[PDB]
Design a protein around this ligand. Sequence first.
Ligand SMILES: [Mg+2]
Lengths: 180, 6
Amino acid sequence: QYLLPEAKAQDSDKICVVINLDETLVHSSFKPVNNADFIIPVEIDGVVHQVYVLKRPHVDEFLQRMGELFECVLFTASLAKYADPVADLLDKWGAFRARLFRESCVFHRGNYVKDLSRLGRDLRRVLILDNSPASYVFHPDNAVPVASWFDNMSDTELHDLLPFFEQLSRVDDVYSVLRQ
Amino acid sequence: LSPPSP
Ligand SMILES: [Mg+2]
């Protein structure tokens, strides 16, 4: 079995891009954060604790456009009980066609690795956007790096990457740009 | 949260 079903007809032509959540699109914390964007109750061993989520600047512009250009898949090493609520509040346009959590990662030498080869998509039409180079150790030529984000609101990295994804969404083989 | 290691 593959992690993903066959892409729907309106997606199958598009490149797949797997998008990381934490420190890529948002940063969360159990330490209280004033003026948080979202707060999400998460049960850990029976006790509910509040998780304070901040949105990386320009994430809404980023997700709305990316959902047009690609078959976008959320792929995080975190747990669904936290990620699904976060994704529900972020994805206001239905950009994520699927969501993949910790149990879909491969544990490789102390790191959770996103094994793109188990997606079920031609790797020449797959990209990964992740703040941890360790997450894409098996497919480094499929990767678009982004710096980890925590709380810098001057950050514009998602905004600055859009013209580059515009190019990538139109090639036939992403390796022609990322070098085979 | 998405941990580097468990
Ligand atoms: Mg990350």
